[PDB]
Structures are given as structure tokens and as C-alpha cells.
Write an enzyme that holds these catalytic residues in place. Structure first.
Site, PDB file in Angstrom:
ATOM      1  CE1 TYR A  38      48.976  51.781  47.169  1.00 31.94           C
ATOM      2  CE2 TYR A  38      50.971  50.911  47.309  1.00 31.94           C
ATOM      3  CZ  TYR A  38      49.934  50.752  47.234  1.00 31.94           C
ATOM      4  OH  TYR A  38      49.266  49.748  46.760  1.00 31.94           O
ATOM      5  CG  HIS A  40      48.784  53.884  42.908  1.00 31.47           C
ATOM      6  ND1 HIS A  40      49.730  53.331  43.590  1.00 31.47           N
ATOM      7  CD2 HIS A  40      47.832  53.172  42.845  1.00 31.47           C
ATOM      8  CE1 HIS A  40      49.378  52.373  43.764  1.00 31.47           C
ATOM      9  NE2 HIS A  40      48.314  52.166  43.548  1.00 31.47           N
ATOM     10  CD  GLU A  58      44.920  51.709  45.263  1.00 28.38           C
ATOM     11  OE1 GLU A  58      44.944  50.934  46.182  1.00 28.38           O
ATOM     12  OE2 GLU A  58      45.038  51.252  44.111  1.00 28.38           O
ATOM     13  NE  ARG A  77      46.608  49.362  48.873  1.00 28.29           N
ATOM     14  CZ  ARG A  77      47.354  48.332  49.691  1.00 28.29           C
ATOM     15  NH1 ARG A  77      47.472  48.519  50.781  1.00 28.29           N
ATOM     16  NH2 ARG A  77      47.778  47.495  48.670  1.00 28.29           N
ATOM     17  CG  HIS A  92      44.295  43.041  48.588  1.00 31.95           C
ATOM     18  ND1 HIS A  92      43.746  43.350  47.341  1.00 31.95           N
ATOM     19  CD2 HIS A  92      45.560  43.591  48.136  1.00 31.95           C
ATOM     20  CE1 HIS A  92      44.371  44.355  46.224  1.00 31.95           C
ATOM     21  NE2 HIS A  92      45.540  44.501  46.791  1.00 31.95           N
ATOM     22  CG  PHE A 100      41.015  46.572  46.893  1.00 28.18           C
ATOM     23  CD1 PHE A 100      41.792  46.449  48.195  1.00 28.18           C
ATOM     24  CD2 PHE A 100      41.712  46.705  45.658  1.00 28.18           C
ATOM     25  CE1 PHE A 100      43.050  46.722  47.937  1.00 28.18           C
ATOM     26  CE2 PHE A 100      42.843  47.270  45.651  1.00 28.18           C
ATOM     27  CZ  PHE A 100      43.723  47.117  46.823  1.00 28.18           C
TER      28      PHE A 100
HETATM   29  N1  LIG Z   1      41.560  45.760  42.397  1.00 28.29           N
HETATM   30  C1  LIG Z   1      41.936  46.863  41.797  1.00 28.29           C
HETATM   31  N2  LIG Z   1      43.226  47.308  41.356  1.00 28.29           N
HETATM   32  C2  LIG Z   1      43.233  48.434  40.973  1.00 28.29           C
HETATM   33  C3  LIG Z   1      42.225  49.464  40.774  1.00 28.29           C
HETATM   34  N3  LIG Z   1      42.830  50.763  40.321  1.00 28.29           N
HETATM   35  C4  LIG Z   1      43.891  50.211  40.074  1.00 28.29           C
HETATM   36  N4  LIG Z   1      44.520  49.262  40.485  1.00 28.29           N
HETATM   37  C5  LIG Z   1      45.671  48.562  40.567  1.00 28.29           C
HETATM   38  O1  LIG Z   1      46.617  49.338  41.027  1.00 28.29           O
HETATM   39  C6  LIG Z   1      47.909  49.017  40.256  1.00 28.29           C
HETATM   40  C7  LIG Z   1      48.580  50.480  40.047  1.00 28.29           C
HETATM   41  O2  LIG Z   1      47.690  51.269  38.999  1.00 28.29           O
HETATM   42  C8  LIG Z   1      47.564  48.118  39.213  1.00 28.29           C
HETATM   43  O3  LIG Z   1      48.265  46.801  39.435  1.00 28.29           O
HETATM   44  C9  LIG Z   1      46.182  47.858  39.470  1.00 28.29           C
HETATM   45  O4  LIG Z   1      45.642  47.911  37.919  1.00 28.29           O
HETATM   46  P1  LIG Z   1      45.566  47.543  36.752  1.00 28.29           P
HETATM   47  O5  LIG Z   1      44.649  46.204  36.741  1.00 28.29           O
HETATM   48  O6  LIG Z   1      44.636  48.515  35.969  1.00 28.29           O
HETATM   49  O7  LIG Z   1      46.506  47.606  35.951  1.00 28.29           O
HETATM   50  C10 LIG Z   1      40.953  49.043  41.144  1.00 28.29           C
HETATM   51  O8  LIG Z   1      39.864  49.756  41.016  1.00 28.29           O
HETATM   52  N5  LIG Z   1      40.976  47.602  41.417  1.00 28.29           N
END
Ligand SMILES: Nc1nc2c(ncn2[C@@H]2O[C@H](CO)[C@@H](O)[C@@H]2OP(=O)(O)O)c(=O)[nH]1
Ligand code: NA
Ligand code: NA
Length: 104
Positions: A38, A40, A58, A77, A92, A100
């Protein structure tokens, strides 16, 4: 008085401002903290209607009042952009799978 409510958590915007400021500072530096690295990028897969421009990042917001400093990110977040504007507060809590929902 809850500016943002994430499940049971009550956030004021000073609370938000403070979380935000630290995440933004680390973003700028090119560093991350915690096993989850974080801050990211937040993709907005959920399709929330943020007014603020993307890219989004976030950073965990702590129910404890404490600024995230490397342990568990919890469920909440703060999302902010590159200009350092607040995009929203998500959680979450109340979302299914690994998605989310927005904090109200
Ligand atoms: N639910 C959710 N997870 C996200 C989002 N952007 C990044 N992440 C998540 O953040 C983590 C680190 O990047 C990953 O597990 C996951 O992405 P992924 O599904 O794309 O892999 C989003 O918009 N929504
Ligand atoms: Na780095
Ligand atoms: Na589940």
C-alpha cells in the site's frame, strides 16, 4: 457524526484527510508498506462514479483512528488520485466475493 460509514466504522473527513495524506506521501516517494504494498493502483472494476479524475490509488483507513503503518489493512480504504484529491471511501464490508461497496 459519520462523514463516511463503512460497515460499523465511523469516519470523519479529518480522519480521511489524515489517512489520505500518508498514502499520498508514499505514492509520490515510489515506496509501499505492508505485505500488500500500500498504496497501490485501484482499478475501479466495481464502476463507482467517482467525480475525481483517475488513476486511482487505495490506502487502508483504520477503524482504530490510527494511520496505516504496515500491519493488517482491515476492510476499509481511502481512494485518492494523483493530484491528491479524495475519490471515495470503500470497504469490503457488505460487498460479496472480494469486491468493495462505497461507504456512506
Ligand atoms: N475489488 C477490487 N480489487 C482491485 C481493484 N483494483 C485493484 N484491485 C486488487 O488489488 C490487488 C493488487 O493490485 C489485486 O488482488 C486486485 O486486482 P486484481 O483482480 O486485478 O488482480 C478494483 O478496482 N477492485
Ligand atoms: Na519502490
Ligand atoms: Na464470500
Amino acid at each position: 457524526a459519520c462523514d463516511y460509514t463503512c460497515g460499523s466504522n465511523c469516519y470523519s473527513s479529518s480522519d480521511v484527510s489524515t489517512a489520505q495524506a500518508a498514502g499520498y506521501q508514499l505514492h509520490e516517494d515510489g515506496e509501499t508498506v505492508g505485505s500488500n504494498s500500500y498504496p497501490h493502483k485501484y482499478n475501479n472494476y466495481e464502476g463507482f462514479d467517482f467525480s475525481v479524475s483517475s488513476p486511482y490509488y487505495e490506502w487502508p483507513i483504520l477503524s482504530s483512528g490510527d494511520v496505516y503503518s504496515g500491519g493488517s489493512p482491515g476492510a476499509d480504504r481511502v481512494v485518492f488520485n494523483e493530484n491528491n484529491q479524495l475519490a471515495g471511501v470503500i470497504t469490503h464490508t457488505g460487498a460479496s466475493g472480494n469486491n468493495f461497496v462505497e461507504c456512506t
